[PDB]
Design a protein around this ligand. Sequence first.
Ligand SMILES: [Ca+2]
Ligand SMILES: [Cl-]
Ligand SMILES: [Zn+2]
Ligand SMILES: [Zn+2]
Ligand SMILES: [Zn+2]
Ligand SMILES: [Zn+2]
Ligand SMILES: [Zn+2]
Ligand SMILES: [Zn+2]
Ligand SMILES: [Zn+2]
Ligand SMILES: [Zn+2]
Ligand SMILES: [Zn+2]
Lengths: 262, 259
Amino acid sequence: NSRVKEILKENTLRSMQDSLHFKVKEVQGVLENTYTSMGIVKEMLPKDTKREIKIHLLKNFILANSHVAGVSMFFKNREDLRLTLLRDNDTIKLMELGNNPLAQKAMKNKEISKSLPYYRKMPNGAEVYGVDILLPLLNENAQEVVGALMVFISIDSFSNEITKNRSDLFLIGVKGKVLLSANKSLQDKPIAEIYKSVPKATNEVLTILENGSKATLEYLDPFSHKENFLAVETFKMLGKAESKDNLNWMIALIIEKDKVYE
Amino acid sequence: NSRVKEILKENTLRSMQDSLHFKVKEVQGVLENTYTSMGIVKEMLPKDTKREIKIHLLKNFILANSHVAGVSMFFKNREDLRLTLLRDNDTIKLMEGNNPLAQKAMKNKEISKSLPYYRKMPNGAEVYGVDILLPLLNENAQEVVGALMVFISIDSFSNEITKNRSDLFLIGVKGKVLLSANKSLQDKPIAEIYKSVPKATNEVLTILENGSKATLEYLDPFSHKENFLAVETFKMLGKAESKDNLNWMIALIIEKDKV
Ligand SMILES: [Ca+2]
Ligand SMILES: [Cl-]
Ligand SMILES: [Zn+2]
Ligand SMILES: [Zn+2]
Ligand SMILES: [Zn+2]
Ligand SMILES: [Zn+2]
Ligand SMILES: [Zn+2]
Ligand SMILES: [Zn+2]
Ligand SMILES: [Zn+2]
Ligand SMILES: [Zn+2]
Ligand SMILES: [Zn+2]
């Protein structure tokens, strides 16, 4: 009889990976839209335009990128072009930069680069878990680095794709850090600690993350005490960019085996 | 053997259906993100910028959207902005307007698409694809000043549909085979290819017209094997309100043996 459960397993794993594969392309496609939008800002910001047009550009960049929660502009030789725009249910512009190590890193890397996830205190006093995306600004003939573009992407804003009306997905960053899960208390914590009761399963997932592969496996969930089918799939979180910092993110999809078997 | 078979049949067909659903959602997601990117190019092109800026933005547009093989812009009052950018192992800039669909798109302020066709590329290769033409408007958004052409490579979607498998088919308007592992079938309608099964092909074409989805079974006259057939349609121009936003379809065959 159990060969029936075995076919049910075969069929469930197939659709998990197809389902998971879509979720990855969806999230990565969203990140790609933002990077594409950033490259346009990058191109226009340093052109011979007046301040208000540059502000006009940063505001519209936030408006059209719902997952962007902030953007900063820095210019070496123009004081009035050192601004930070943070999402405050609208946009709040704060004048300022220069000593910011993110602006300095942006100007020393030709390719799009990143920081690591972190909590930013927002104008309304709330904490937003996110990550910074960096680009350099170049003058007309591309000869000189003249400024920096710094984009704060909200990881919490991906709740729409990961946790809205479902609880079977995790977003995992480098070193196996949980970036977003339905279990809010897991954010910013490593899976080696969360799931230390299944070190063989976690060590495979972490290996799959480091190598940029994909896989399916089983594990006993320590929270539900039920065995889950688990599908993982990594993806380059900076997109098509060839960059030192274009590392692997991972999305996990779980299905408790009991629901399949009947 | 009774309840077991029923459990296996409908669980395998559900897995087949869900898999096709997520492939359809992958494809139209790739298209819509390309359309979002195109809308950005659309709005920036009329803005006050130098020729070199417009060119590099179109060049960046092609490189960011891997399914676009070509893009062209035409300005009514800027002859130096009548250009075509095509993939050529890299990107090649050519100079050119008289396209009746560009006139249609401009005069009516509506998006319009061409029929699928074969474009001869710079390197001599022939690429099956579709043209999507958009009007360009001035800053005040009241007068049409030009047109933007985007040549989407249908063949480039083999990475999602045809690579490493032969169980998927992309079907266009009136059952035209747009993409298939069997390349000889491209640009040919299913009504002729599978004339021997009018019941299934007529179902397919009705599903295509109604924008519906369904699973059915048919005897494939090529493989001589009983197969299931899951189909699902989708608007190929995304959410654009336009009488040219016809339904495309992805079809998935699974040999009835597996069930
Ligand atoms: Ca599939
Ligand atoms: Cl068509
Ligand atoms: Zn404005
Ligand atoms: Zn503008
Ligand atoms: Zn989103
Ligand atoms: Zn067990
Ligand atoms: Zn039944
Ligand atoms: Zn569907
Ligand atoms: Zn693709
Ligand atoms: Zn894919
Ligand atoms: Zn067989």
